[PDB]
Design a protein around this ligand. Structure first.
Ligand SMILES: *[C@@H]1O[C@H](CO)[C@@H](O[C@@H]2O[C@H](CO)[C@@H](O[C@@H]3O[C@H](CO)[C@@H](O)[C@H](O[C@H]4O[C@H](CO)[C@@H](O)[C@H](O)[C@@H]4O)[C@@H]3O)[C@H](O)[C@H]2NC(C)=O)[C@H](O)[C@H]1NC(C)=O
Ligand SMILES: *[C@@H]1O[C@H](CO)[C@@H](O[C@@H]2O[C@H](CO)[C@@H](O)[C@H](O)[C@H]2NC(C)=O)[C@H](O)[C@H]1NC(C)=O
Ligand SMILES: *[C@@H]1O[C@H](CO)[C@@H](O[C@@H]2O[C@H](CO)[C@@H](O)[C@H](O)[C@H]2NC(C)=O)[C@H](O)[C@H]1NC(C)=O
Ligand SMILES: *[C@@H]1O[C@H](CO)[C@@H](O[C@@H]2O[C@H](CO)[C@@H](O)[C@H](O)[C@H]2NC(C)=O)[C@H](O)[C@H]1NC(C)=O
Ligand SMILES: *[C@@H]1O[C@H](CO)[C@@H](O[C@@H]2O[C@H](CO)[C@@H](O)[C@H](O)[C@H]2NC(C)=O)[C@H](O)[C@H]1NC(C)=O
Ligand SMILES: *[C@@H]1O[C@H](CO[C@@H]2O[C@@H](C)[C@@H](O)[C@@H](O)[C@@H]2O)[C@@H](O)[C@H](O)[C@H]1NC(C)=O
Ligand SMILES: *[C@@H]1O[C@H](CO[C@@H]2O[C@@H](C)[C@@H](O)[C@@H](O)[C@@H]2O)[C@@H](O)[C@H](O)[C@H]1NC(C)=O
Ligand SMILES: *[C@@H]1O[C@H](CO[C@@H]2O[C@@H](C)[C@@H](O)[C@@H](O)[C@@H]2O)[C@@H](O)[C@H](O)[C@H]1NC(C)=O
Ligand SMILES: *[C@@H]1O[C@H](CO[C@@H]2O[C@@H](C)[C@@H](O)[C@@H](O)[C@@H]2O)[C@@H](O)[C@H](O)[C@H]1NC(C)=O
Ligand SMILES: *[C@@H]1O[C@H](CO[C@@H]2O[C@@H](C)[C@@H](O)[C@@H](O)[C@@H]2O)[C@@H](O)[C@H](O)[C@H]1NC(C)=O
Ligand SMILES: *[C@@H]1O[C@H](CO[C@@H]2O[C@@H](C)[C@@H](O)[C@@H](O)[C@@H]2O)[C@@H](O)[C@H](O)[C@H]1NC(C)=O
Ligand SMILES: *[C@@H]1O[C@H](CO)[C@@H](O)[C@H](O)[C@H]1NC(C)=O
Ligand SMILES: *[C@@H]1O[C@H](CO)[C@@H](O)[C@H](O)[C@H]1NC(C)=O
Ligand SMILES: *[C@@H]1O[C@H](CO)[C@@H](O)[C@H](O)[C@H]1NC(C)=O
Ligand SMILES: *[C@@H]1O[C@H](CO)[C@@H](O)[C@H](O)[C@H]1NC(C)=O
Ligand SMILES: *[C@@H]1O[C@H](CO)[C@@H](O)[C@H](O)[C@H]1NC(C)=O
Ligand SMILES: *[C@@H]1O[C@H](CO)[C@@H](O)[C@H](O)[C@H]1NC(C)=O
Ligand SMILES: *[C@@H]1O[C@H](CO)[C@@H](O)[C@H](O)[C@H]1NC(C)=O
Ligand SMILES: *[C@@H]1O[C@H](CO)[C@@H](O)[C@H](O)[C@H]1NC(C)=O
Ligand SMILES: *[C@@H]1O[C@H](CO)[C@@H](O)[C@H](O)[C@H]1NC(C)=O
Ligand SMILES: *[C@@H]1O[C@H](CO)[C@@H](O)[C@H](O)[C@H]1NC(C)=O
Ligand SMILES: *[C@@H]1O[C@H](CO)[C@@H](O)[C@H](O)[C@H]1NC(C)=O
Ligand SMILES: *[C@@H]1O[C@H](CO)[C@@H](O)[C@H](O)[C@H]1NC(C)=O
Ligand SMILES: *[C@@H]1O[C@H](CO)[C@@H](O)[C@H](O)[C@H]1NC(C)=O
Ligand SMILES: *[C@@H]1O[C@H](CO)[C@@H](O)[C@H](O)[C@H]1NC(C)=O
Ligand SMILES: *[C@@H]1O[C@H](CO)[C@@H](O)[C@H](O)[C@H]1NC(C)=O
Ligand SMILES: *[C@@H]1O[C@H](CO)[C@@H](O)[C@H](O)[C@H]1NC(C)=O
Ligand SMILES: *[C@@H]1O[C@H](CO)[C@@H](O)[C@H](O)[C@H]1NC(C)=O
Ligand SMILES: *[C@@H]1O[C@H](CO)[C@@H](O)[C@H](O)[C@H]1NC(C)=O
Ligand SMILES: *[C@@H]1O[C@H](CO)[C@@H](O)[C@H](O)[C@H]1NC(C)=O
Ligand SMILES: *[C@@H]1O[C@H](CO)[C@@H](O)[C@H](O)[C@H]1NC(C)=O
Ligand SMILES: *[C@@H]1O[C@H](CO)[C@@H](O)[C@H](O)[C@H]1NC(C)=O
Ligand SMILES: *[C@@H]1O[C@H](CO)[C@@H](O)[C@H](O)[C@H]1NC(C)=O
Ligand SMILES: *[C@@H]1O[C@H](CO)[C@@H](O)[C@H](O)[C@H]1NC(C)=O
Lengths: 120, 419, 120, 120, 50, 50
């Protein structure tokens, strides 16, 4: 039930421990320790900025309007959520995360403009 | 059909290097995680190496620098009952030292080990200290101990340390039993060469670890599953005197020896040592042939710092001859006494531009320690000899079970949920 | 009307100055000053992360689905909002804030899963 | 199409590149470099805090309930979005941004209180 | 103690002065160009002396 | 008369200096000091550093 305890569990089980890991992301001699702390903050903020760009700010589970390409993975839901742990899944689609991230950004950019014109 | 869903807080990580921090004077099992470990490519070792050296150097910054003592010394034989084993080991050296006032000098005599001095012009009365041509010696502060106090290394947020709990793990490859820890166990920075002292023991069997076992250019780290106790002594009663060589600057030296002069030595139980080697041989035969010959031999060459077992015993620096431990051939209440030399001028790390003077310790010295592993090199019939000159190997022996990874909490997967 | 000016006022009055305090949370010799600045940022981010975990990201007043236990405090609304300043209130329930924070996290975790299954 | 590429383009064109610039805001000798990094983080967080205060957290385009005063600028939409680049616009209304920011904060403070009383 | 000082012990052969060589023609072309541009800030029917 | 690696020894050294680096003392034509001996300590640049 602690940090990374679910690392060996199935994706559908591990997805219930997202707050366990989220809370462990934040907290001349002594300078390299400041560099490590500053860097940890910068890393954290980049992931948070990215979620904001995709329209997922403030949440751990975020649904989008980006469809899945089976060229990315053609496994079904029982193969992915009831087997392939998150470590296994990450390896399998590592080659596609930049394509997916680009498509999440493009979608949010269309959504924010369509919503401003409906408030007009 | 399926849509991209974004998840944050995902239990995923990647191998990474970072800066670990100290902790000096918690564990999660990860049930179905198998992880790939690789000691020798473990950067925790490189960090520990640099931190130990840096802390060592920092401790000498406020200590007396012995530049007034780079003078000619006039050395004669010590007028005492010196045994055969000690003839030529000590010299009684006179010199003109500075005092707290610039226009005054004092005549000082002291005892030096022969290893710390060198003749000038091949003259038998005039000697200089060993480092006067390469460096300034700094005297270690008498109030600061050399005790190897345990250090724990802790990860920064966003990182984690994984630990391998497999009792038969040899430093590389998959580890089926892995846990996550906040900070490592306390590791004592014991500095020694060919015999690893006061480390961790193997849980079940002697473990032989090598980056490439068939490569004779690599060292073999042997972890024992039982300690071998070694008793070291300097059986001479030293009278320690001091002088002021400057404005509040005191130099410490041995004035004299009370009683007879005898050689320093270490004792290893003969039977315990023979059992230890039998176990090492059985495991070597799993990498080498079974119907083979395993021979142990003494170190082949190099200076005193690498051909002997070097260690700090009660503040003194010992250089013990281990040919009595590694002289046997294994084909298909006695003790072993190992003679030891003592030095006051040492270089610690394999460096050229630094030297330290270890002030002598008053009285008679005895220390007891555990041999918890060996460092061997390899030349039918295989021959193994003691190695261990590079301190990074001492630290690999404790850090081999730990790995540092970076946490990567953001990821995506297909679901039936759409915005 | 300045920073902490409302500290001696009633909770229902002080609650109208939340932006006054929120804006004053952000901004070898000189190293201890960097440590103080890095630490101030880390503190700030932990409070913001915690609000996000509870589903209160981006707001100063956030209503939740966590009921009040009168074992925590059995005072009524006139006792709490028209007397007990925030300093007094903080002392009275200090023993219960970890229980309340845990219950806020548990609730948000159920809410995000119930909303993803209704978008399915 | 890169960072600040749209700087010379019209406001209505440049507004489509907001993610290009947003992503370039985040990433004794060596101390002044830490000071620069710590400062960059603090600057970033102040702008993000300010958007949160105004009720614009998590978005690049945010509509508000604050009307435009033509005392601030009396130009029409074709003058502003089909000419005056953002650099030109920033110069023209620089004298009024503190008035506008104050009015955005006041509006959000009324909105959060009106919404808590409708959930009651 | 490990501190070496370096110095010139001697000179082999004759002792001559160190010097630099600038092409005369290239230098005169260079100044002519500089003068033409100085005359855009200073008068045209002027004298420029180096 | 230069110092040596031992404090109680001296060595006689001769070297060539440029006149710009030395100054006469008391207007004496045999006795000169280095230029900086009255204002600073000179540090020798390391020969291994370009
Ligand atoms: C392997 O581990 C063993 C077990 O820990 C270790 O043996 C210990 O060594 C220390 C240091 O030599 C011993 O501590 C000393 O004991 C004497 C006798 O009572 C004291 O007088 C000493 O105090 C003086 O010196 C200190 C500086 O060292 C000063 O700070 C102090 O004020 C005094 O002037 C000191 O307490 C300890 O007793 C032994 N332990 C045992 C069980 O024998 C061994 O050294 C380790 N080996 C290696 C290579 O690290
Ligand atoms: C190491 O072993 C030697 C024996 O080989 C020990 O020497 C004896 O010490 C006692 C005093 O305790 C004397 O009475 C004996 O006469 C000594 N014997 C010999 C042959 O010299 C020695 O003490 C042991 N070691 C250590 C490290 O203390
Ligand atoms: C080192 O040599 C000195 C002499 O140079 C020894 O000290 C002398 O000892 C005799 C007795 O044998 C005394 O009468 C003298 O007065 C002492 N001289 C001085 C200057 O103290 C000294 O004992 C020798 N050191 C050792 C360890 O044997
Ligand atoms: C440790 O002691 C052994 C003797 O027991 C030394 O070995 C001798 O080394 C010389 C070369 O200097 C050879 O000629 C002899 O044949 C060797 N003797 C034996 C019995 O093999 C060894 O050199 C010593 N080691 C150290 C570091 O002092
Ligand atoms: C600087 O002066 C020294 C003498 O003070 C010159 O060295 C001597 O040269 C003669 C030959 O002309 C030798 O016989 C001597 O033995 C040398 N003396 C010493 C101390 O080496 C030296 O050559 C002069 N330097 C220069 C650059 O001319
Ligand atoms: C799905 O992807 C199809 C193939 O795209 C190509 O292969 C994948 C693995 C990526 O490497 C990508 O960069 C390549 O272009 C497309 O032909 C198909 O149109 C895509 N489906 C969409 C976007 O509707
Ligand atoms: C989900 O998929 C299950 C496994 O399918 C088979 O094995 C995988 C690894 C692929 O090679 C695939 O092409 C194979 O057919 C099926 O047994 C299961 O019925 C599927 N579930 C649904 C609802 O379709
Ligand atoms: C309300 O709390 C009741 C008592 O809970 C106990 O006392 C409080 C003060 C805390 O210390 C808590 O940890 C103790 O368990 C519960 O019996 C009651 O069920 C709670 N109401 C709920 C949760 O419905
Ligand atoms: C709110 O509470 C007021 C005070 O109640 C009394 O004093 C407090 C401190 C407790 O000891 C409580 O048990 C006492 O009864 C009441 O006067 C007031 O009527 C209450 N208001 C409402 C709407 O119920
Ligand atoms: C619009 O602004 C009118 C004039 O306000 C004044 O001039 C502007 C440029 C600012 O400097 C401001 O501080 C001055 O007060 C107001 O008279 C008018 O009421 C405002 N419109 C509103 C708020 O409805
Ligand atoms: C938008 O404005 C255009 C320009 O208006 C004129 O020039 C500006 C700079 C001011 O001085 C203004 O007072 C002038 O009248 C008009 O040509 C255009 O028709 C206007 N568009 C609409 C829809 O009203
Ligand atoms: C590990 O696998 C077993 C099934 O073999 C399963 O019961 C257990 O829950 C799994 N561990 C984790 C952390 O999911
Ligand atoms: C693993 O995958 C299969 C489909 O390939 C699915 O039937 C099963 O539910 C998954 N998990 C288990 C329990 O084996
Ligand atoms: C991923 O990319 C590698 C090349 O980098 C390729 O060999 C592999 O087949 C790709 N497919 C996967 C694992 O999705
Ligand atoms: C001094 O000791 C050496 C041994 O190192 C010996 O060879 C020499 O003869 C001794 N000299 C005297 C005068 O005793
Ligand atoms: C110490 O100084 C005296 C002169 O006072 C000298 O005779 C003696 O040789 C010097 N000692 C050494 C080691 O040089
Ligand atoms: C110092 O002298 C020894 C000989 O006694 C020599 O081996 C060593 O290389 C010398 N050190 C330096 C820096 O020249
Ligand atoms: C260590 O274990 C790995 C994996 O089983 C093996 O490939 C390697 O040869 C072993 N090395 C030694 C020295 O035992
Ligand atoms: C291990 O060493 C042997 C020589 O004994 C060499 O042929 C082999 O390539 C080395 N293997 C690796 C992985 O370096
Ligand atoms: C060593 O000398 C001291 C006097 O300084 C004495 O008290 C002690 O008993 C002596 N110890 C031995 C082993 O001779
Ligand atoms: C070392 O000393 C202990 C007592 O401290 C003794 O029991 C043991 O037998 C000794 N070991 C050897 C090899 O002499
Ligand atoms: C060491 O073990 C070998 C092999 O069993 C045996 O022949 C030898 O006598 C033993 N030596 C000692 C000292 O026990
Ligand atoms: C080597 O000998 C041991 C007995 O000492 C035996 O158990 C093992 O199976 C043998 N290995 C091989 C490869 O013959
Ligand atoms: C090895 O042991 C033999 C006796 O078996 C002995 O003669 C020889 O000198 C020893 N070698 C060393 C280096 O001690
Ligand atoms: C040697 O190991 C034993 C067993 O773990 C331990 O009790 C003893 O204290 C150790 N000896 C030293 C000197 O650390
Ligand atoms: C302090 O209490 C008085 C009533 O005694 C009240 O009028 C005043 O507004 C209070 N001050 C603050 C800051 O609320
Ligand atoms: C304080 O509490 C009482 C209820 O206990 C309430 O009637 C009153 O409104 C509150 N504030 C004032 C104005 O005293
Ligand atoms: C809070 O806890 C303390 C003990 O830490 C206890 O004495 C007190 O009664 C508790 N009640 C409050 C003030 O809510
Ligand atoms: C610059 O102005 C021209 C019209 O003169 C326009 O076509 C071009 O797109 C503008 N450049 C940018 C970056 O907008
Ligand atoms: C610039 O402004 C005018 C209105 O003043 C408008 O008609 C035009 O669309 C704008 N842009 C262009 C294309 O000139
Ligand atoms: C802005 O303020 C300046 C004075 O700071 C004033 O001269 C100017 O007219 C004002 N108007 C603008 C450019 O909006
Ligand atoms: C400088 O040297 C180059 C050859 O390196 C030669 O061609 C050129 O003419 C020389 N310049 C002068 C001014 O002498
Ligand atoms: C200066 O003279 C140049 C010709 O060398 C001519 O082109 C230029 O126009 C003249 N400028 C003025 C101000 O007369
Ligand atoms: C050193 O002496 C020179 C004359 O040789 C003089 O000009 C200079 O000012 C003096 N420097 C100082 C610091 O007095």
């Amino acid at each position: 039930l602690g940090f990374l305890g679910a690392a060996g569990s199935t994706m559908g089980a591990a997805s219930m421990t997202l707050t366990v890991q989220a809370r462990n992301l934040l907290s001349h001699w002594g300078i390299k320790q400041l560099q490590a702390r500053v860097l940890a903050v910068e890393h954290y903020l980049r992931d948070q900025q990215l979620l904001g760009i995709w329209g997922c700010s403030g949440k751990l589970i975020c649904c989008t309007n980006v469809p899945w390409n089976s060229s990315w993975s053609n496994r079904n839901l029982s193969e992915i959520w009831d087997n392939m742990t998150w470590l296994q899944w990450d390896k399998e689609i590592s080659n596609y995360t930049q394509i997916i991230y680009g498509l999440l950004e493009e979608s949010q950019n269309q959504q924010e403009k369509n919503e401003q014109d409906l408030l007009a | 059909n399926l849509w991209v869903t974004v998840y944050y807080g995902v239990p995923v990580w990647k191998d990474a290097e970072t800066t670990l921090f100290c902790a000096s004077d918690q564990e999660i099992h990860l049930e179905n995680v198998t992880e790939e470990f690789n000691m020798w490519k473990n950067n925790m070792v490189e960090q520990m190496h640099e931190d130990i050296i840096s802390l060592w150097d920092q401790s000498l910054k406020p200590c007396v620098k012995l530049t007034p003592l780079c003078v000619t010394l006039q050395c004669t034989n010590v007028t005492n009952n010196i045994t055969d084993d000690m003839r030529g080991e000590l010299k009684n050296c006179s010199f003109n030292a500075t005092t707290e006032l610039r226009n005054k000098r004092q005549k000082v005599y002291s005892l030096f080990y022969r290893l710390d001095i060198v003749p000038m012009g091949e003259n038998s009365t005039n000697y200089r200290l060993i480092n006067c041509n390469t460096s300034a010696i700094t005297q270690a502060c008498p109030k600061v101990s050399f005790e190897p106090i345990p250090i724990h290394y802790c990860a920064p947020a966003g990182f984690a340390i994984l630990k391998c709990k497999d009792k038969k793990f040899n430093g590389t490859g998959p580890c089926p039993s892995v846990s996550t820890v906040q900070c490592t166990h306390g590791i004592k920075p014991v500095v020694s060469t060919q015999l690893l002292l006061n480390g961790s023991l193997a849980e079940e069997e002697v473990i032989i670890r090598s980056e490439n076992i068939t490569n004779n250019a690599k060292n073999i780290l042997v972890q024992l599953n039982t300690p071998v106790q070694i008793n070291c002594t300097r059986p001479n009663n030293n009278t320690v005197k001091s002088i002021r060589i400057g404005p509040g600057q005191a130099f410490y030296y041995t004035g004299d020896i009370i009683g007879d002069i005898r050689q320093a030595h270490c004792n290893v139980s003969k039977a315990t040592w023979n059992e230890t080697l039998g176990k090492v041989v059985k495991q070597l035969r799993k990498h080498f042939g079974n119907n083979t010959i395993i021979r142990f031999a003494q170190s082949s060459g190099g200076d005193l710092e690498v051909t002997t077992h070097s260690f700090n015993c009660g503040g003194e620096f010992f250089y013990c001859n281990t040919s009595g431990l590694f002289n046997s051939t294994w084909i298909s209440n006695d003790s072993i006494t190992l003679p030891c030399r003592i030095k006051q001028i040492i270089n610690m790390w394999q460096r050229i531009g630094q030297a330290m003077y270890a002030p002598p310790i008053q009285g008679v010295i005895r220390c007891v320690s555990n041999i918890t592993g060996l460092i061997l090199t390899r030349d039918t019939t295989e021959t193994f000899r003691p190695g261990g000159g590079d301190m990074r190997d001492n630290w690999r022996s404790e850090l081999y079970k730990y790995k540092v990874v970076k946490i990567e909490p953001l990821g995506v997967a297909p679901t039936r949920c759409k915005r």
